[PDB]
Amino acid sequence: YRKLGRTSDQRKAMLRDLATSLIISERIETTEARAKEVRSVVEKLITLGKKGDLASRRNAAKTLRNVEILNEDETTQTALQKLFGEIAERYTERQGGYTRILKQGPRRGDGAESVIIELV
């Protein structure tokens, strides 16, 4: 695995903050090497959603943050309920994958290769 230029405690925190906002917004834009690493983290988290029992509900809460979504029709759900509620429905037949990575050009301030990672 990669180190991403951070310390062990910072890398873990940056990687689960990044995985949460991919559940909220379903496609985000970041660098190349960071998207290669959050690829495997978020798909192990949909596997927990497809099981659906209590013990894996407890295990996914190790990783996700506490974020409220202002859902449509003025409803509100947490990020954990949205994982076991909607994403677990769409991928009940597929056996892996669930994400893709699309490359773009460099940014201006760096030569950093931008990347869109989306949820499929």
Binding site: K103, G105, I116
Partner: protein, 48 residues
Amino acid sequence: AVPKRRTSKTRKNKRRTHFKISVPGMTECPNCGEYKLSHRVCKNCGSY
């Protein structure tokens, strides 16, 4: 630690013969638009 002689114009120019830059990948956007970079996504001025 310090240079003993100056460097002439020839020896300076022989040194930077590899100090160059390369042309990029340059595929095409076949649907609509100008050239994009290879294995990338033709977002702006592009439909691929």
